[PDB]
Design a protein around this ligand. Structure first.
Ligand code: BB2
Ligand code: ZN
Lengths: 445, 480
């Protein structure tokens, strides 16, 4: 039945885009309009009882217009015809006061997804609040009952939403798509000898039937939380570092900002001179897969309506391309690569070792499992972040560690990766296993 | 303000006082401790200069209603991006489903009370011409570029928000606010012999854009900040590797008050303490910081970015002493957590918008000044770091571990500030770090009006402050 609510919403959104474009058309050289609507439920439990029930409904329309290469933008959450009219007028008025900028404008017609692919992103569920509560409660209760050292809770949580997005522009593109996301988590607190620790586990997917069970979530939550108890603060040292899979994804994630066209044309990236250079090991390829069916970050077009493409961003260690949008492409004398709004599923294969085998290879060193702070310079690659994780000796985890930092430079870190594990994290945009680096500076006692 | 806001949010949308009664009544059909209606309309603009031209401008509008039903620990919540009777009815009928049992229906009569004005009700978007606003950005560009030949790029942005809110609750609260907020941000890139670095400055508060053209220590504020961004960039360009490990750290006055925001601020929000999940839970009356430390959260500061004439529950902003001479005095609250803890609202019940739940949140968090001069503090260090500016920070309130990352820092060698060092993340335990504060300066200042605090995905304008202070032992995430 929810399919009908979504199809009604989609028709309304399509009409809102067409209305906005027509209102802009006689007064601008170009215009781009995006609208979205997201609806669903978010629930939490505390000690297995309902805590919060939140009903979500968010809508939005944005327009950008261009005249004499001058741009103006406006947005509204109200999608009434009169609100749309006011929004269009506001953008047009702004464009009288901004300066001509020839790199600005609607994306090139030759790059637009006029006939956008169906990526099967929409798997709705009629989950009632009571059903949502029971899933959250089950996850939380499974964590709480795992071990008597679990003495408090931050709850179970369940989220289920559907979305409709429509984009159009003055080249005649008008395409939209629907999507869903569902997730289930729990987060509990353990104590030992006057030390409290918190950790969490979760499952996420586009279809409810892709989720791990509540009991799986709770068991993982408890396992992770209990593993943090009674940490040591390491002494200041140099040692090898494994980025556990869950933070290894973020290690590769820093690449996005460093090869973004916006950073490149402004010369504000440490990789400015690295296009076609080997910045990673010669066996390492980062594959982008924007059209994976049901993919967590799949998209049929970027935020400027540009087609998304299968590309090897890194191929055998070599940086093959920048991540360009229409504006940054134009600054560089290039064409958009369909990266307005970010990256669309990165995949990095393992090199054959399990996490356990990686511990044995390293022998002695630090496993980082959680990082804190920004501490990454876009312009130099300098890296300094707070860390928690585990000390490893004799190829075995010895004790958890916290209240330490890890420091280095991304250029050196990336180039000298020893291996990547087969323990792939599969809940994220970037998916990879654990990553072994030969040395970082660890600050501590 | 209440009559003006009521005319704009209620009367203009076909609503009367008696509709408020009807909707609160619908909530009170259920067995609730509390219910509220939160109305909002807001207007945001931004303008950006880059490559010596006005590149971009935006105008963004939002409005809506949010409705909560609360019973003990429990909150039902629904909202709509429109202010209408139907939106209110739909939202109340969803929110009240948090409990099935009938209530007695006994609500308190709605009645507004006065609160102290903390900022103008004049709309900052309409109070200066567009070309005058753009002239602010043009002057920032010219000043930054003239400051040093190595300046190659300048991005300067101006943003302004005008927001009306009204809140009505089953406990009789009826209150409104009119909230202006403006911000100027400047980013510069410097280049020398193929080496590049960046610097930033800016600020603002709850007033019109004229503030950026007003005098700051004998110069035009915009000009002073343009020069500061360049200065920061050039320092960073010259910086060498930071040392690694535990050492004394002297923090500058102002924005380095991120220390307090992370080390104690979030940990003293009442939601975590009511649940027992904060390291500070049950520690009222204990020594949680050195005896030189008195930390306040102050929502009452005229014109400041982080202030709240009323919070989002209608509670007027307060000067709340959290830590007094090292002793924990209490927590920041919202109405839910105050009731559960047997305490009272403190003026810390804040929500990002009508589309989000309020929770306990900071306003302006700062440490009171002490007796030491900043020079005396620097002179006390044989080897360590002086960090007069930071980026951001983060805390885990359960394990009591926090970080914050330098944006300008120097070695101290033999009681003198010497070489600039590269950005480093500093890490410590909150309580243990506060207990290591051995000198507190006589030079309190707050940040320029730049802070955004995040909690549970909700961003808010928040201030920090402190004098210069010395932390005897803190772990510095350098490489050297
Ligand atoms: C009042 C907030 C104090 C700083 C802490 C916050 C994050 C936070 O809420 N931590 O608990 C932050 O880093 N905010 C940053 C921040 O506000 N900054 C970073 C540099 C200056 C200022 C500019 O907005 C960014 C990430 C938004
Ligand atoms: Zn914060």
């Amino acid at each position: 039945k929810v399919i009908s609510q979504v199809e009604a919403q989609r028709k309304i959104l399509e009409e809102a885009v067409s209305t906005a474009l027509e209102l802009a058309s006689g007064k601008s050289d170009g215009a781009e309009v995006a609208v979205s609507k997201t609806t669903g439920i978010s629930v939490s439990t505390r000690y297995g009882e309902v805590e919060n029930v939140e009903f979500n409904s968010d809508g939005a329309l944005g327009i950008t217009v261009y005249h004499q290469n001058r741009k103006g933008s406006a947005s509204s959450t109200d999608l009434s015809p009169q609100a749309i009219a006011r929004t269009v007028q506001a953008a047009l008025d702004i464009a009288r006061y901004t300066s001509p900028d020839p790199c600005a404008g609607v994306a090139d017609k030759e790059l637009l997804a006029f006939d956008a692919p169906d990526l099967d992103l929409f798997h709705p569920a009629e989950v009632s609040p009571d059903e949502a509560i029971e899933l959250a409660a089950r996850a939380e209760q499974a964590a709480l009952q795992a071990d008597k050292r679990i003495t408090n809770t931050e709850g179970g949580s369940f989220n289920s939403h559907y979305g409709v997005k429509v984009f159009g522009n003055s080249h005649g593109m008008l395409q939209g798509y629907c999507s869903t996301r569902h997730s289930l988590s729990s987060c509990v607190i353990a104590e030992e000898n006057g030390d409290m620790e918190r950790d969490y586990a979760y499952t996420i997917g586009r279809a409810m039937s892709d989720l791990q069970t509540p009991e799986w979530v709770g068991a993982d939550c408890a396992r992770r939380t209990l593993s943090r108890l009674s940490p040591r603060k390491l002494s200041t040292m140099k040692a090898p570092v494994i980025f556990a899979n869950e933070v290894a994804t973020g290690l590769f994630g820093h690449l996005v900002g460093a090869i973004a066209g916006g950073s490149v044309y402004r010369k504000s990236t440490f990789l400015l001179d690295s296009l076609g250079k080997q910045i990673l090991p010669d066996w390492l390829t980062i594959e982008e897969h924007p059209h994976l069916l049901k993919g967590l970050a799949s998209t049929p077009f970027d935020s400027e309506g540009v087609r998304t493409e299968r590309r090897d961003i890194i191929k055998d260690g070599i940086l093959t391309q920048w991540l360009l949008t229409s504006y940054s492409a134009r600054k560089l004398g290039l064409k958009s690569t369909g990266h307005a709004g970010g990256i669309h599923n990165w995949r990095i294969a393992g090199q054959g070792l399990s996490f356990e085998q990686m511990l044995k290879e390293m022998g002695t060193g630090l496993v980082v499992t959680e990082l804190m702070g920004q501490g990454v310079s876009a312009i130099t690659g300098d890296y300094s972040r707070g860390a928690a994780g585990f000390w490893v000796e004799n190829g075995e985890i010895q004790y958890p560690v916290s209240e330490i930092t890890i420091a280095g430079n991304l250029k050196d870190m990336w180039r000298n990766i020893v291996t990547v594990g087969n323990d792939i994290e599969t809940r994220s945009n970037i998916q990879c296993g654990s990553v072994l680096l030969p040395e970082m500076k660890i600050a501590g006692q | 303000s209440l009559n003006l806001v009521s005319e704009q949010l209620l009367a203009a949308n076909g609503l009367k006082h008696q509709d408020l009664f009807a909707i609160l009544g619908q909530l009170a059909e259920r067995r609730l401790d509390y219910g509220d209606l939160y109305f909002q309309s807001s207007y945001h603009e931004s303008w950006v200069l880059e490559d010596r031209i006005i590149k971009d401008g935006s105008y963004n509008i939002d409005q809506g209603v949010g409705v909560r039903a609360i019973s003990g620990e429990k909150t039902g919540f629904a909202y709509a991006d429109q202010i209408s009777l139907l939106a209110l009815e739909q939202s109340a009928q969803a929110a009240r489903t948090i409990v099935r049992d009938s209530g007695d229906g006994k609500v308190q009569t709605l009645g507004a009370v006065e609160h102290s004005p903390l900022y103008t009700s004049v709309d900052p978007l309409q109070s200066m011409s567009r070309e005058e606003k753009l002239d602010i950005l043009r002057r920032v560009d010219k000043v930054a570029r003239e400051a040093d030949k190595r300046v190659q790029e300048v991005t300067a942005s101006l943003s302004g928000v005008y927001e009306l809110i009204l809140v009505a609750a089953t406990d009789g609260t009826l209150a409104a606010d009119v909230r202006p907020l403006v911000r100027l941000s400047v980013s510069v890139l410097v280049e020398e012999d193929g080496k590049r670095e960046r610097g930033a400055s800016g600020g603002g508060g709850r007033f019109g854009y004229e503030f950026f053209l007003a005098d700051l220590d004998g110069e035009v504020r915009a000009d002073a900040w343009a020069k500061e961004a360049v200065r920061m960039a050039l320092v960073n360009l010259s910086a060498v590797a930071a040392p690694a490990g535990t050492m004394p750290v002297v923090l500058g006055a102002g924005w380095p008050g991120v220390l307090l925001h992370e080390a104690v601020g979030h940990g003293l929000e009442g939601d975590f303490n009511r649940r027992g999940t904060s390291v500070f839970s049950g520690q009222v009356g204990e020594l949680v910081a050195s005896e030189l430390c008195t930390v306040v959260d102050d929502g009452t500061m005229v014109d400041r970015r982080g202030s709240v004439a009323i919070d989002d529950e209608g509670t007027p902003g307060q000067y709340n002493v959290l830590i007094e001479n090292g002793i924990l005095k209490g927590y920041m609250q919202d109405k839910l957590n105050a009731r559960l803890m047997g305490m009272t609202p403190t003026g810390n019940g804040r929500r990002e918008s009508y589309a989000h739940l309020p929770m306990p949140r900071m306003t302006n968090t700062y440490m009171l000044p002490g007796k030491s001069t900043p020079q005396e503090i620097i002179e006390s260090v044989e080897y360590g770091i002086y960090a007069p500016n930071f980026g951001g920070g983060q805390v885990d309130i359960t394990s009591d571990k926090f970080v914050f990352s330098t944006s300008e820092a120097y070695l101290i060698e033999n009681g003198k500030v010497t070489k600039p060092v590269k950005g480093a993340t500093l890490i410590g335990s909150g309580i243990e770090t506060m207990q290591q504060i051995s000198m507190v300066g006589n030079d309190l200042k707050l940040d320029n009006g730049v802070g955004v605090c995040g909690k549970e995905g909700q961003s808010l304008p928040v201030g920090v402050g402190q004098p210069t202070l010395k932390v005897d032992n803190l772990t510095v995430g350098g490489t050297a």
